Amino acid sequence: RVKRLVVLGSTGSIGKSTLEIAREFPDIFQIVGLAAGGSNLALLAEQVAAFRPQYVYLGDSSKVAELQERLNDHERSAAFPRPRLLLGDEGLAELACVPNYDILVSAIVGFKGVLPTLKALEAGKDVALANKEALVAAGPVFRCLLSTRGLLYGDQERKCGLLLPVDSEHSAIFQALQGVPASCYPPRKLLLTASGGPFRGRTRDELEQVTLESALKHPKWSMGAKITIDSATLMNKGLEVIEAHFAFGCPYSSIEVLVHPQAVIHSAVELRDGATLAQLGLPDMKLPIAYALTWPHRLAAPWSAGVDLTREGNLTFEKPDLNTFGCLGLAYEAGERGGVAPACLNAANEVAVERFRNKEIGFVDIEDTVRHVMALQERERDNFSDVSLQDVFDADHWARTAARAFKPRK
Numbered sequence: 001r002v003k004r005l006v007v008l009g010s011t012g013s014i015g016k017s018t019l020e021i022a023r024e025f026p027d028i029f030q031i032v033g034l035a036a037g038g039s040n041l042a043l044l045a046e047q048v049a050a051f052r053p054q055y056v057y058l059g060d061s062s063k064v065a066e067l068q069e070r071l072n073d074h075e076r077s078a079a080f081p082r083p084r085l086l087l088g089d090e091g092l093a094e095l096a097c098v099p100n101y102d103i104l105v106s107a108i109v110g111f112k113g114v115l116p117t118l119k120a121l122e123a124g125k126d127v128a129l130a131n132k133e134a135l136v137a138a139g140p141v142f143r144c145l146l147s148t149r150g151l152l153y154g155d156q157e158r159k160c161g162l163l164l165p166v167d168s169e170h171s172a173i174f175q176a177l178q179g180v181p182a183s184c185y186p187p188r189k190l191l192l193t194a195s196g197g198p199f200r201g202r203t204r205d206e207l208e209q210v211t212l213e214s215a216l217k218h219p220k221w222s223m224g225a226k227i228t229i230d231s232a233t234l235m236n237k238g239l240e241v242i243e244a245h246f247a248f249g250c251p252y253s254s255i256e257v258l259v260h261p262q263a264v265i266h267s268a269v270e271l272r273d274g275a276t277l278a279q280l281g282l283p284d285m286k287l288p289i290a291y292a293l294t295w296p297h298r299l300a301a302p303w304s305a306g307v308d309l310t311r312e313g314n315l316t317f318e319k320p321d322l323n324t325f326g327c328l329g330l331a332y333e334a335g336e337r338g339g340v341a342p343a344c345l346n347a348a349n350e351v352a353v354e355r356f357r358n359k360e361i362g363f364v365d366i367e368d369t370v371r372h373v374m375a376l377q378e379r380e381r382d383n384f385s386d387v388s389l390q391d392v393f394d395a396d397h398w399a400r401t402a403a404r405a406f407k408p409r410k
């Protein structure tokens with residue numbers, strides 16, 4: 001009855017919110033595993049000491065000695081059973097395959113979450129999937145593995161484990177879809193709401209003078225760096241459009257993106273009769289994270305506040321400006337092309353976001369980086385057809401090298 005969790009990326013935004021839930025409901029949740037990359041070992045050490053995982057994976061093996069030290073400090077305050085450390089590229093896979101856990105919280109960023117996510121599902125474990133990049137890149141493989149071309153989340157296949165959404169928009173849609181019978185599925189239209197990010201209503205030339213600083217101040221949501229930057233480019237919504245296609249089995253024509261700055265409506269579905277079902281809330285990821293862990297039950301928490309529309313003011317809905325923010329067009333083009341185009345788009349974007357965060361390239365060059373890569377992938381072969389997992393790996397790599405080699409125009 002307890003749910004044993006393995007949290008990947010425990011030190012990030014999603015990971016910490018997950019453990020906040022585990023801490024408030026210790027009778028329900030037990031932590032068997034934590035994984036982190038090593039950039040914040042002080043927090044990993046305090047997480048290990050608090051939750052006493054049996055297994056810990058460390059993405060950077062160079063910092064085993066520092067982790068051991070910080071654990072040794074915590075042991076002097078209070079003794080706890082030392083975990084077995086897992087390392088290397090095979091470490092994440094072994095952790096995901098441990099028996100003795102029910103749910104894998106996949107909150108690693110990027111393509112490095114794909115495989116652990118895959119082997120947990122195959123190992124019969126449910127996956128609360130935050131890592132959108134997995135489904136963007138390896139959508140077909142998830143669809144084949146879960147043996148569905150429709151709704152991948154849930155068990156509405158009415159052995160593999162269940163896949164449940166953590167992202168705010170996919171959670172809203174998934175909650176709104178609860179109770180929609182098969183006769184009304186797929187929905188007519190999927191409405192994904194985007195805050196529009198901090199540069200809403202700015203010209204493309206106003207975006208030349210934009211600092212990393214300004215890009216990292218998000219109006220409605222407090223999150224990681226990559227996702228916050230992607231909301232400023234609107235490549236975050238672009239990625240969610242492709243994720244939705246594979247997750248809900250909807251054509252790209254059925255998928256609409258509305259700029260809703262107040263971020264009150266988290267996303268919606270339109271049904272055959274013209275009824276729209278929308279899920280509303282405050283911008284806190286503990287609701288969706290918790291729903292992925294409790295589905296179909298909903299936990300009542302001290303932070304479980306709820307939105308007051310009278311107080312909130314007024315709700316605005318607008319079309320995105322596809323000229324200024326070309327990343328959204330790039331996602332739609334990539335999705336319609338199919339094959340490994342989604343993968344190349346994601347990798348090119350990951351690289352451009354990192355280069356933008358290391359001050360090597362500027363903001364406007366993120367879109368031009370992604371455009372450059374995909375122009376070339378079009379010129380190279382287009383056989384697509386079947387999408388092998390290794391085919392995704394090869395394109396991801398190729399795209400990363402091309403994204404790094406891109407030199408901004410002079």
Ligand SMILES: NC(=O)c1ccc[n+]([C@@H]2O[C@H](COP(=O)([O-])OP(=O)(O)OC[C@H]3O[C@@H](n4cnc5c(N)ncnc54)[C@H](OP(=O)(O)O)[C@@H]3O)[C@@H](O)[C@H]2O)c1
Nearest residue numbers: 009010011012013014036037038039040059130167223224
């Ligand atoms: N509000 C949200 O944040 C939100 C909402 C919806 C979806 N998502 C999606 O979920 C993913 C996580 O986003 P986030 O904001 O939580 O990212 P983040 O805050 O930057 O967290 C990154 C996590 O991944 C760990 N990590 C990095 N490299 C690793 C590696 N090689 N091996 C093991 N762990 C590694 C990191 O450890 P260290 O930092 O210690 O190195 C850290 O714990 C993203 O795809 C995001 O698009 C996020």
Ligand SMILES: O=CN(O)CCCP(=O)(O)O
Nearest residue numbers: 168194195196197231236
């Ligand atoms: O998990 C929450 N999001 O992905 C949405 C916040 C980013 P947006 O500006 O694209 O709505």
Ligand SMILES: [Cl-]
Nearest residue numbers: 148150151156
């Ligand atoms: Cl289905």
Ligand SMILES: [Mg+2]
Nearest residue numbers: 012013014015
């Ligand atoms: Mg996280």
Ligand SMILES: [Mg+2]
Nearest residue numbers: 031051052053
């Ligand atoms: Mg434990």
Ligand SMILES: [Mg+2]
Nearest residue numbers: 335336337338
């Ligand atoms: Mg096609």
